[PDB]
Amino acid sequence: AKIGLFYGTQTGVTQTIAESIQQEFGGESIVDLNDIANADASDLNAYDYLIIGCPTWNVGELQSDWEGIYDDLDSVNFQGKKVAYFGAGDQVGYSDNFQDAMGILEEKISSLGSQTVGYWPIEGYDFNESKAVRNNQFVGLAIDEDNQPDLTKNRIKTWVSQLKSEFGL
Ligand SMILES: Cc1cc2nc3c(=O)[nH]c(=O)nc-3n(C[C@H](O)[C@H](O)[C@H](O)COP(=O)(O)O)c2cc1C
Numbered sequence: 001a002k003i004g005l006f007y008g009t010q011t012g013v014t015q016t017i018a019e020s021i022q023q024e025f026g027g028e029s030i031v032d033l034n035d036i037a038n039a040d041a042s043d044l045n046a047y048d049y050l051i052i053g054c055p056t057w058n059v060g061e062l063q064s065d066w067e068g069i070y071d072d073l074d075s076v077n078f079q080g081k082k083v084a085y086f087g088a089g090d091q092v093g094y095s096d097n098f099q100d101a102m103g104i105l106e107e108k109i110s111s112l113g114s115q116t117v118g119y120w121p122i123e124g125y126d127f128n129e130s131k132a133v134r135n136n137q138f139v140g141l142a143i144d145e146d147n148q149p150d151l152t153k154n155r156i157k158t159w160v161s162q163l164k165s166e167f168g169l
Pocket of ligand 1: 099146
């Protein structure tokens with residue numbers, strides 16, 4: 001597989017999303033699925049295409065496994081990689097920090113030389129602030145299983161379909 005997906009999760013939602021994205025891409029032969037709790041930052045070097053999934057916890061913080069590796073990301077060579085992101089969040093409970101983690105990771109990784117692809121429009125959501133917004137789009141797939149579970153399936157399907165192109169699929 002030429003695409004590597006690395007996710008982190010506290011309660012399992014992000015994992016489930018990760019599994020669905022893998023299946024939408026076409027399976028294990030298309031995307032390698034990895035829990036970041038088991039990886040080294042160095043594992044990220046193998047791929048030209050990455051998908052980073054991370055939920056936001058504790059009012060605007062990264063999920064703990066991502067927080068653990070955060071400082072090691074500098075050691076990865078992201079030059080030339082295309083990276084797409086996804087995150088789980090709750091726009092009602094955390095309106096002022098909706099999907100911040102996705103935003104924090106994207107800012108770090110993009111600054112290291114990768115190109116973000118996979119922007120997602122903000123129509124259909126309601127939140128006050130987010131670190132993951134740029135030019136009025138999310139930098140990646142914003143999922144909200146707490147408030148909008150009925151939208152998830154479609155959001156994933158649409159997003160993957162847009163991604164396919166950018167990943168040379
Ligand atoms: C105590 C607590 C704090 C949270 N903080 C945030 C937050 O700052 N921003 C946000 O978008 N969602 C926040 N969430 C919502 C979660 O990210 C969300 O429930 C997600 O589905 C959890 O994903 P996981 O199972 O992969 O960890 C919080 C949830 C809890 C329970």
